[PDB]
Amino acid sequence: MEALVLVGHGSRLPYSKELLVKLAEKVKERNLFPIVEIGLMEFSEPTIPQAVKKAIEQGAKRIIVVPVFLAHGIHTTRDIPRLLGLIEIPEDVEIIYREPIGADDRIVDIIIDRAFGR
Amino acid sequence: MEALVLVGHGSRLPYSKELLVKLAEKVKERNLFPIVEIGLMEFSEPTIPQAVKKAIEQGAKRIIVVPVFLAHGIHTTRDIPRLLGLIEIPEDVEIIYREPIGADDRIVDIIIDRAFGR
Ligand SMILES: [Co+2]
Ligand SMILES: [Co+2]
């Protein structure tokens, strides 16, 4: 009844989409969610609406959208809330737009390990 | 003798720069590095060359540049290695260009907490 939609920027390069896909897989391996889909905002497929529709077609009534972005930007405050009709497609269900990653202590952990070539 | 330079995108919005600054502070609190500076690519200050110079002026001979980005993109593969003269300013100092964040298991942790409004 719950779906998690991971949402990302998307580049013309494939790294960004690879990143989303690997992330989705790892959350699948954690078995917390019935439905788990990804969506990219620009120049990639599947797109955010495609992902939301795909979640709904699988019968999800609460769609948790997580913006996989470090910080808030135009994308997280305008475009995505727009694409989800949260501002200014979906019937019956409620979309739950979550927060970005932000300056989480676990990121400073990752940054340090990254600094040391680890 | 070692400096850590955190490097980020930068938007016209201030969230991105806030993010870098908070991160730099937290790594300062961890007391692992003599010198710790931030630099943004565009739209904001300090810029990446400014940050590198600032590290050098403080007497660092090994500059560890960490790209605070989820994935590789044009920025991490072209522009930043360019700005650091690593491809097509420094004296007798070696710049060490580290990896981005990538699909780290700690990010899937962050994503889950983020999904639950935590
Ligand atoms: Co964008
Ligand atoms: Co950019």
Size of interface A-B (CB pairs under 8 A): 126
Of A24, A16, A85, nearest in space to B9 by CA = A16
Cβ within 8 Å of residue A9, ≥6 positions away: A16, A40, A41, A42, A69, A75
H or E stretch covering A3: strand A2-8
Of B84, B31, B96, nearest in space to B60 by CA = B96
Q: Is A4 on the interface with B (CB under 8 A)?
A: yes
Report the C-alpha gap between B74 and A1 in whole angstroms: 39
Which chain A positions have a beta carbon within 8 Å of B15's beta carbon? 71-73
Lateral strand order in the sheet of A94-97:
A35-40, A2-8, A62-67, A94-97
What domain count does chain A have? 1
Cβ within 8 Å of residue A52, ≥6 positions away: A5, A37, A39, A63, A65, A84, A89, A90, A95
Give the 3-state secondary structure of residue A84: coil
Q: Is A26 on the interface with B (CB under 8 A)?
A: yes
Question: What's the token pair of residue A97?
Answer: 């737009």
What does this entry list as its resolution, in Å? 3.0
- Domain that residue B73 falls in: 1-118
DSSP-derived secondary structure letter, B79? I
Ligand 2 centroid to Cα of residue B13, in Å, is 13
8 Å CB contact between A4 and A33? yes
Positions of A annotated as catalytic residues are 9
Asked how this structure was determined, the answer is X-ray
The identity of residue B93, as a single letter, is V
Of B29, B40, B49, nearest in space to B6 by CA = B40
Report the C-alpha gap between B17 and A1 in whole angstroms: 38
8 Å CB contact between B11 and B71? no
DSSP line for A11-78:
-SSSHHHHHHHHHHHHHHHTT--SEEEEEESSSSSSBHHHHHHHHHHTT-SEEEEEE--SS--HIIII
Question: What's the token pair of residue A101?
Answer: 């990653």
